Design a protein around this nucleic acid. Sequence first.
RNA 1: GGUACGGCGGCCAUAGCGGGGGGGCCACACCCGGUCUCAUUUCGAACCCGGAAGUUAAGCCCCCCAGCGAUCCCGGUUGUACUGCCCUCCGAGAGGGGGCGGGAAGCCGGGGACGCCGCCGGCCA
RNA 2: CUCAGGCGGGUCAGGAAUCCGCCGUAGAGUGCAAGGGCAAAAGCCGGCCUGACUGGACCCGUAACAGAGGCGGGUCCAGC
Lengths: 169, 96, 182, 196
Amino acid sequence: LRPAKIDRYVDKPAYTRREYIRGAPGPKITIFDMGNPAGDFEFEVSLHTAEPVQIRQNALEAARQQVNRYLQKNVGRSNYHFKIRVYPFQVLRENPMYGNGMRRPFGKPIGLAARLKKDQKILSIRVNRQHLKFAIEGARRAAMKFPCKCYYRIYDKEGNDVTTKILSQ
Amino acid sequence: VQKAHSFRRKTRKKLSKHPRRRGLPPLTRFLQEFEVGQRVHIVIEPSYHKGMPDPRFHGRTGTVVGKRGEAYIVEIKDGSKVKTLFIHPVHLRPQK
Amino acid sequence: IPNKEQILADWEAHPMRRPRIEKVTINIGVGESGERLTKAEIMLQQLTGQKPIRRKAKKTNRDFGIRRGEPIAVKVTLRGPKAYELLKRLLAAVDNRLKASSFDEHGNVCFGIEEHINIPGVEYDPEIGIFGMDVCVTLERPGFRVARRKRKRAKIPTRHKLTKEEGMVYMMEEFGVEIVEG
Amino acid sequence: AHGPRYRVPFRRRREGKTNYRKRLKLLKSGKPRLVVRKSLNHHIAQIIVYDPKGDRTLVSAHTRELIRDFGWKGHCGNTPSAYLLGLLIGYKAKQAGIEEAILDIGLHPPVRGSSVFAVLKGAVDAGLNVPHSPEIFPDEYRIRGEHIAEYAKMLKEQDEEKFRRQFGGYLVKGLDPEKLPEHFEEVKARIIEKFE
RNA sequence: GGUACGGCGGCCAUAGCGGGGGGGCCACACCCGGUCUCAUUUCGAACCCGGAAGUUAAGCCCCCCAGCGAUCCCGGUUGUACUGCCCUCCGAGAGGGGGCGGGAAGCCGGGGACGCCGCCGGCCA
RNA sequence: CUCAGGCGGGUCAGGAAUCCGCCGUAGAGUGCAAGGGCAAAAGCCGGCCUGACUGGACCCGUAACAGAGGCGGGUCCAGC
């Protein structure tokens, strides 16, 4: 597996038309909703990206697995809702290189990634007051697996930012 | 790979029509008249396939300098060359 | 029919709202081209008076042994006093009861006849087995020509469109009875 | 319409009154149009010219003016009435100064011997130069109106109540269905003498 | 000059779809019958020929709505997103920023909108 | 004359034979790739026909601007 810095940046154009892309791989991440989606939770911790970034499906799956394990261990399946709000659409290609070099260098698909915009939410963990610390820790652990700087905010049901208010008292 | 220019080369959107404008256009544009020296814009009607100028000259403004049959003779200046075209009135619009 | 008397009152108040038979169509699904098809043709000609229409096969289906362009079924359509008399004859030949689960959303009746009655004739010179038909009678109101004429064609509103209960009421008043299919 | 991409037809097309494909072909001539239109109880004939902002009618004729003026007590939705109206509109056009026109039968089909072609024949007899071919005209006996008299005689020979049902209006009006050819000839002579 | 009358058009949904009430001087229709004209790849269903016993039930005409569709105005998001020219402005990089000039889309709230308009004719006056 | 698909109803007949009513902006179809255009049609079904012709002009494209043998297309005059 090549370094993620090769695909971290969004200079290249969007490459997501499976009708014309030949051999595009299938997704490696298949679960995006976990916990109790229909539960009534007071607070929502959302993780935002600081820069326009491409997050590989491998990183998304790793963050999903670790955060879900931590939440199951420390919260309870019926006390949280962990959701990943972005699906990988961009197709990551690579130069398929006795042995020519840079001749016909158009790349073949090798993976998938999700492209995001500045200050865009990546994932959201809905929890009650008690489990806010665990939600924050899970968000931090997820952020530690991404190729860019990320921050987290706490919103109430309406959508007002109350992160400082809550974390202070 | 180099591609030569043809009549419909790269005209997916230029020669397309608004979805609500599908069908025959009103007959005023078809039956309009012009006078020598009048200046007219070249706006192609994709539905009518007769008397259509090359799409490369779509959107320009030319000078009427005569008439042949039901087509108007329109002169344009491409760079420094004078080009004469025979355009059906349905593909024309008066200036102002 | 809880609204039977209301429908009758509406009909008598407004004669132009009285439903009438539009057309009665007899169809024979012979499923084959040959002497059996010709037998169906001649039997329908004798039954009605006017010549039938041969229907071709749409697409192909080797399961049914059909080929595109091959005539398959036979159709005939009747209107007017002839339709009235012939419909009475077929409804008498079949048992005089129509099942409730046969009127469509627009008060049209579609049933089937498998036995021959009402001056049928038991001639078996042709295939003979070609007997058996589906009868479809359509209902309308007098002002339905608007949706069918070419010039100044318009649409019929739900106020003038027919319905199941009205079709059943008209059928009962004209002739016949309804059964609850068990 | 139930979506942004829905294409609502022109108002006249929705009303089912105009055939724009034929209208364009008619207008490509750039000549006055002799428009003939039919109704259950009347006929309409007009002569129209094109304006890029709206058609203008020069001379118009109707059948309601045949009952008055000249005097025509027959049914105004038949071939003799159509012929008389054609004569009237043709003479009116000649008076107005238009001598040639192009027939416009709207959405009506081009069926031989129809009242529209009877109107065309009447206009031609009046003197208007409307292009045509003689094979499309109705027969002379039908133009005169014999077939109606023959049908009335057949009804009289058959059950009389059916004849009264068929020609009830003529009885109350005061005209026997027979001799209608004579009535039509009198009306035609009146019109010709008036306009000549 | 009137008319809840018709024919031929213009822009071609702000005009469409769906609903509610009202009308039959004339006119438009439904509709009665198929000898003659015309027709069914059967059917006078359509088209065509001949009329008025009935009806305004509905096409049509007059008035009304904001459920869907469309679309005009104003306010908020917002001078936000984006962008033309210059830069010895910042940023490791990605990229951003300052000066002058342009400026959305979508969404939310309040109004508009169930079409205007032209030539001629019928009937009455 | 109007399609694809769907809904309700019909003897054999069922998922699919052949029909009947309604909804249906084309979600069908075009001789063929894709794009565009076509619904009282350019699609479907029918009638007649051969202009898929002869003698010639001017113009656009290949080849913007900016030169061209050959080729393709457009607007016309005359004949039959």
